């Protein structure tokens, strides 16, 4: 199929005489453009007049001369006090005594002590990570080591790490940063220089690993079974480091896995296991909630679901064990798994399954294993839209996700007078070692987000999908470590019968893009050659695929494939892709709209909070977007009003929230990414005069090059994420894919609606029986030959072939000119991350190429 392209008929000359000065300038390619040692982390024993954390020499101060022997004693006396004056300390010392990890912290601590690597194994929340490290580093100060102890423990998530690193700190009755503290992203809290446990996320320890691990002596990899690629990273690196230095001791910590295979990672090493007071869950699945709740559905809500599936089905495996039944069940109960669907959850049984654990009127918080972030809103809209589960003094919800506000988080977590019955919506991720308070009943929906694909083939996909059996038992697990609870989980018993043991490890179903980052960033050698040394070997396709992805674009200063020499192109917490768009964007002086639409492409988050039914977007949905139609755009406006609002008010912007979509939590997200990549540039040289925010009028059609750049290098920072509306909502993807506009976006309509330009380009794309596609933006077909490209088939075709994907004419000379222009493009961008403080005043032919490109970004062609 082939949508029209051209919405006027015109091209200016001067434009183009300008583009011959340009090209003419740099004497660039006048051609049709188709043309074209491992090492090992340093260490030392702790020793004075250097800082442990920091990688520096201290200097300055009372420590510039004491030395780590006098720190001993010292620690010796402060512990003593500690003993003697502090009665809490005395009475959390009584209070880990009774855990059942105390009983065997001697055999612990001998294991510890002579050997280097041993793996410790236990139920989650049991007590390993709040009690390991502790034992570790009583040891060492008892022993008379006190200054030569430095422990690492490596939660999975940011909220797991901050959560336990608060957790010790208060039964050691102390602030942050004396003896323990967090190093997470946005923030840290950073120990004393010797003597302390610092709880830091994977990501950052490797990001530590930089400045090399002098005057560590303990690492503690925590949660080995959730099996993720940072974890392996952190293995691998641990283990190749303790083959080179024998006196680093390393402690893992696992839940349930097999025990035979990281013994013999290691060659056969100690493997510890100590049960914690694991009181018993009883499971009961969707059967029973039907049989007790007699769970009949709405004829309206039936007639919605069938009108939604007819709908999606329309685009030409289902076995359906929602069907399948024993004959012990009622007839009405079998009915009722006849007309409930597995593939979503119906909000009609999560309100029975919350009604019936009300009369059960057993106290304890519940837990909901929800599998996205879009389905929490919407659950979180539902339950606070119902009366009866909207009582401020008898419900409340908080999300419970990594990367939502630092408030949130820190609401998660506070106690409530009396008892509100917290219905945690969480995906699985926020499951293990934060224990957060007493959970009694876990609503597991069995559906887990899994990212699918790997390497650069169609770069995104966001489906739903089944959870495992060992997943379910550690969810079952999760409840009733207060007093024995149930897992109330929501499928059919065949269903389970049928899940699978595990899911597919994360190594193989995620992109290696980043690993090979942190690798060079590390100066850790090749691919092929570490991820040999790993846990389980990529495939060489994978890898093979990965590199070339990563040296195709400019992330790394690499001859062929050194290095990303100094620092700045894995440095930023963002996609590849989206950080060389940013840069680019900062080069053209919209580094502001760069950067909120990097996080906003980075946070896969709904921006328009879609009401309780009715899904479709209202008139005053629409209006943010203005005439552009993007979702973007739409962003921007929405972004700025909040800026404004947030500025005046506090109570008003609340309540100017429930205007137009404007989710709370999506704009916190996207603006607290955006200033974090902003003060990172700010940080790697490169000028606060390009920083500006521009302000963004939608309403006006016509002259804005700002936001037509911006809109402009979006098509750069999702290719090749490039959809052609082709009518009502059916689209088609790249290799003749078909796809649905979602109806969070505004594009969609119901109407033979015909765009002013038909082509899009999108970030998400959910992947369900159909396929969907979301954060939909119009660009204009300029920007799609700007950052498409591809080549004009002039063998006689004459159906002016660009993109590879989409077709029509943009007088082929014009496409030549940006053929030629893409590694102009490519050599500003190296220029200017050789010099950051110079982009601002470059030689005269970058600016002329800046300011043609922008003249040219102009929607307008007529």
């Known amino acids: 199929d082939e949508q029209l392209k051209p919405y006027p008929v015109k091209l200016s000359p001067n434009l183009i005489n300008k583009i011959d000065e ?60 500690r ?35 041993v793996i410790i194994r236990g139920n989650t929340g049991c007590g390993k990570t709040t009690q390991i490290a502790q034992y570790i580093l009583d040891d060492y100060i008892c022993s008379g080591q006190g200054g030569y102890a430095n422990i690492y423990v490596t939660q999975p998530r940011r909220i797991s790490a901050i959560s336990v690193a608060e957790r010790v700190a208060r039964e050691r009755c102390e602030q942050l940063g004396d003896t323990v503290g967090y190093s997470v992203r946005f ?83 100690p493997v510890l296991e100590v049960p914690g007071r694991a009181f018993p869950v009883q499971q009961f699945f969707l059967e029973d909630i039907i049989q007790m709740t007699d769970f009949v559905p709405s004829a309206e809500s039936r007639r919605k679901r069938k009108e939604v599936e007819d709908e999606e089905q329309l685009l030409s495996a289902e076995i359906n064990y929602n069907k399948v039944c024993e004959d012990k069940y ?91 019955t917290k219905i945690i919506l969480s995906t699985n991720i926020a499951e293990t070692s934060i224990t957060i308070d007493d959970i009694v009943f876990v609503i597991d929906i069995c559906k887990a987000r899994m990212k699918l694909f790997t390497s650069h083939n169609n770069l995104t996909s966001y489906a739903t999908v089944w959870a495992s059996k060992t997943n379910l038992e550690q969810r079952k697990g999760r409840a009733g470590r207060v007093r024995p609870g149930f897992c109330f989980t929501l499928c059919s018993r065949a269903r389970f019968q049928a899940l699978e043991d595990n899911l597919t490890p994360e190594m193989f179903r995620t992109p290696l893009h980043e690993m090979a980052l942190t690798i060079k960033l590390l100066r850790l050698g090749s691919i092929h050659h570490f991820l040999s040394k790993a846990l389980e070997p990529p495939p060489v396709d994978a890898v093979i695929e990965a590199e070339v992805l990563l040296r195709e674009m400019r992330c790394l200063d690499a001859n062929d494939e050194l290095t990303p020499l100094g620092r700045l192109l894995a440095r930023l917490p963002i996609e590849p892709r989206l950080g060389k768009m940013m840069v680019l964007g900062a080069v053209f002086g919209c580094a502001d709209l760069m950067a909120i639409m990097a996080s906003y492409s980075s946070t896969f988050s709904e921006v328009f909070s879609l009401d309780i039914g009715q899904r479709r977007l ?7 977007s203005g005439t552009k139609c993007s979702d973007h ?34 704009m916190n997200v996207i603006w607290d990414a955006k200033q974090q990549l902003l003060d990172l540039l700010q940080q790697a040289g490169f000028p606060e005069e390009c920083m500006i925010s521009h ?40 290799e003749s894919k078909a796809a649905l506009l979602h109806k969070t976006s ?117």
Not at 618 to 624: E, I
Not at 848 to 862: F, H, I, P, R
Request: charged share 25%.
């Open 187 to 269: 923030e840290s809290v950073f120990p004393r220089p010797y003597g302390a446990i610092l709880f830091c996320t994977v990501g950052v320890l490797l990001r530590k690993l930089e400045a090399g691990l002098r005057g560590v002596s303990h690492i503690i990899v925590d949660e080995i079974h959730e099996r993720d690629v940072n974890s392996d990273f952190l293995l691998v690196i641990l283990r190749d480091m303790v083959d080179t230095y024998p006196d680093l001791h390393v402690i893992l910590m696992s839940a349930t896995i097999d025990t035979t295979k990281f013994s013999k990672y290691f060659g056969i090493c």
């Open 83 to 117: 003993r003697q004056n502090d009665n809490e300390y005395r009475q959390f010392l009584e209070f880990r005594e009774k855990l059942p990890i105390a009983a065997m912290r001697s055999e612990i601590l001998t294991a510890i002590n002579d050997n280097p690597v």
């Open 618 to 624: 209202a008139n005053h949905q629409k209006a943010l």
């Open 695 to 734: 302000e963004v009028d939608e309403r006006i059609d016509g002259d804005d090059p700002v936001l037509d750049v911006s809109l402009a290098l979006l098509c750069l920072g999702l290719y090749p994420n490039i959809c052609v509306h082709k009518e009502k909502r059916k689209v088609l993807t790249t």
């Open 22 to 81: 340009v090209i003419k300038g740099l004497d660039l390619p006048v051609v049709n453009p188709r043309n074209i040692e491992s090492s090992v982390i340093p260490w030392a024993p702790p020793q004075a007049n250097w800082n442990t954390w920091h990688a520096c020499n201290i200097d300055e101060g009372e420590l510039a001369t004491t030395s780590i022997d006098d720190l001993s004693m010292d620690y010796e006396r402060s512990l003593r006090d």
């Open 746 to 862: 505004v594009n969609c309509s119901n109407l033979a609606v015909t765009f002013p330009y038909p082509f899009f380009v999108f970030g998400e794309k959910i992947r369900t029986r159909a396929v969907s596609c979301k954060q939909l933006s119009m660009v204009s077909p300029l920007q799609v030959i700007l950052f498409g490209s591809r080549k004009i088939d002039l063998a006689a075709n004459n159906i002016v072939r660009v993109d590879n994907w989409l077709n029509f004419d943009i007088e082929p000379e014009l496409a030549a000119k940006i053929g030629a222009l893409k590694p102009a493009l490519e050599d500003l961008i190296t220029v200017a991350c050789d010099n950051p403080s110079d982009i601002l005043r470059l030689e005269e032919p970058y600016a002329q190429l800046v300011k043609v490109v922008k003249d040219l970004c102009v929607k307008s062609a007529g």
């Open 633 to 666: 755009v739409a962003m921007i406006v929405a972004s700025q009003m909040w800026r404004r609002e947030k500025q005046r008010g506090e109570h008003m912007e609340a309540r100017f929230c429930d205007w137009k979509g404007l989710q709370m939590s999506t």
């Open 330 to 420: 009622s007839q009405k109960t079998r009915n009722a798994m006849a007309m409930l669907s597995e593939s979503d959850v119906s909000f009609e049984l999560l309100e029975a399954l919350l009604m019936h654990i009300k009369s059960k009127n057993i106290p304890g918080a519940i837990l909901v294993f929800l599998p996205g972030w879009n389905l929490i809103f919407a659950l979180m809209k539902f339950l606070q839209n119902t009366n009866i589960f909207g009582d401020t003094s008898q419900y409340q919800i908080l999300p419970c996700h990594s990367q939502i506000p630092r408030d949130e988080q820190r609401k998660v977590f506070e106690p409530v007078p009396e008892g509100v």
